[PDB]
């Protein structure tokens, strides 16, 4: 099976800059009947199937911009976008079209640059409705930051708590190039009534110390 | 304009069988081989099966043999994949793409997918929890907890409040989901203007409306 290896998995760009992503094969893809290295590059935008940008390692599909180039041979291949636009923030994969099983790469995701922004961290106690039922989630939103690197951490009565948390993250907001995070600590009512302080703490590049959000039960 | 339209994907118990069709128009069908590629929720694409323009040669990965069968009916212009011995790891969106007989060059024509969720959980409606806070902004949340299957659709004041709203991608618990959302209003807005979360779970014909009080 040729493994496909693309690095990086996420590339952060500025519109108008040149950017190059790598695709590596475990073996060669050079097909000597067609005299072509059978690598294909695909782009995909959320909601869509993938679409060919480049086939035979370097031939561009009819309709792909001049800025997209495929280059390389044998086991080492690259996509290059001469000057990235925002219509280009998508995921890019390579594919082995040379022999079964056909293998796709892992993708490289274009994420766009913007200035750093520390998070509006906010923490909410459990609703009554929930405490009716025997359970107790303490939610902590950490909205609108940049970069994606953020660490969030719970604490009950000063000790660090690990079991019971759920975090979801959002992609780059369309209108401001920013990420947002949810963190929930679900407990039982007994574990809830047994404590008082609840802390949602966050570390992010923007700040030399964490942003502490908290409350007494 | 070539047109591949998939069908068949449903919620199917780990074990059971399912057959998806893919109707193709706008090219001489008989001239091309067809494929089924699969993309997992971790957004990973996977080849699943190729078939000859004529039918006689079929090709599978070590992970599908024995459980799936690519099939076509050139008289009805349709591909098929009978899937059996269904597993959890098989949940995904299934696409049919056509093979480039002539140019040997990438999968140029894709369909629009069909989703299959292999799982045995019962359809559960969520618990809708209003999250009132403990200056400028006042952030409020809504926790939608313990439901099956996806989706729920969550709106704050019926799509009227639609600025500074954050709906987070849902995560699967022990066969159950959970999702939350945050809206940021201003000090003057709430409590003087009521914010209410609206959560419908079509699948359990649920629609709950949560007035988040102070």
């Amino acid at each position: 099976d040729i493994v496909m290896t693309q690095s990086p998995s996420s590339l952060t760009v500025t519109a108008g800059e040149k950017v190059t992503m790598s695709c590596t094969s475990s073996q060669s893809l050079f097909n000597s009947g067609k005299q072509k290295n059978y690598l294909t590059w695909y782009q995909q935008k959320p909601g869509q199937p993938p679409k060919v940008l480049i086939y035979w390692a370097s031939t561009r599909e009819s309709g792909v911009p001049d800025r997209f180039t495929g280059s390389g041979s044998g086991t080492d291949f690259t996509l290059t976008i001469s000057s990235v636009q925002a219509e280009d923030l998508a995921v890019y994969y390579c594919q082995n079209d040379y022999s079964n099983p056909l293998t796709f790469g892992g993708g490289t995701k274009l994420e766009l640059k913007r200035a750093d922004a520390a998070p509006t961290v906010s923490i909410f106690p459990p609703s009554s409705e929930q405490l009716t039922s025997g359970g107790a989630s303490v939610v902590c939103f950490l909205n609108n930051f940049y970069p994606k690197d953020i660490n969030v951490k719970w604490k009950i009565d000063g000790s660090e708590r690990q079991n019971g948390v759920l975090n979801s993250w959002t992609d780059q907001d369309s209108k401001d190039s920013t990420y947002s995070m949810s963190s929930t600590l679900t407990l039982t009512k007994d574990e809830y009534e047994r404590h008082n302080s609840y802390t949602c703490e966050a570390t992010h590049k923007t700040s030399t110390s964490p942003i502490v959000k908290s409350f007494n039960r | 304009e070539v047109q591949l339209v998939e069908s068949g994907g449903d919620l199917v118990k780990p074990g059971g069988s399912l057959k998806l069709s893919c109707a193709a128009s706008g090219f001489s069908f008989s001239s091309y081989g067809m494929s089924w590629v699969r993309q997992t929720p971790d957004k990973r694409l996977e080849w699943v099966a190729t078939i000859s323009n004529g039918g006689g040669y079929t090709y599978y990965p070590d992970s599908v043999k024995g459980r799936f069968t690519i099939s076509r009916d050139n008289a009805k212009n349709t591909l098929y994949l009978q899937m059996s011995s269904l597993k959890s790891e098989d949940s995904a969106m299934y696409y049919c793409a056509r093979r480039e007989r002539y140019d040997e060059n990438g999968f140029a024509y894709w369909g629009q997918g069909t989703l299959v969720t292999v799982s045995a959980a019962k359809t559960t409606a969520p618990s809708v929890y209003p999250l009132a806070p403990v200056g400028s902004s006042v952030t409020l949340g809504c926790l939608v907890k313990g439901y099956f299957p996806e989706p729920v659709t969550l709106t704050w004041n019926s799509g009227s409040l639609s600025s500074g709203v954050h709906t987070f991608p849902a995560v699967l618990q022990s066969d159950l989901y959970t999702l939350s959302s945050s809206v940021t209003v201003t000090s003057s807005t709430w409590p003087s203007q009521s914010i209410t979360c609206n959560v419908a779970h079509p699948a359990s014909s649920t629609k709950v409306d949560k007035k988040i009080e102070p």
Binding site: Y38, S99 | S52, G54, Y59, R99, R101
Partner: peptide, 8 residues
């Protein structure tokens, strides 16, 4: 006529 896949 029924042909093998190029990638076979």
């Amino acid at each position: 006529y029924d042909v093998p896949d190029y990638a076979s």
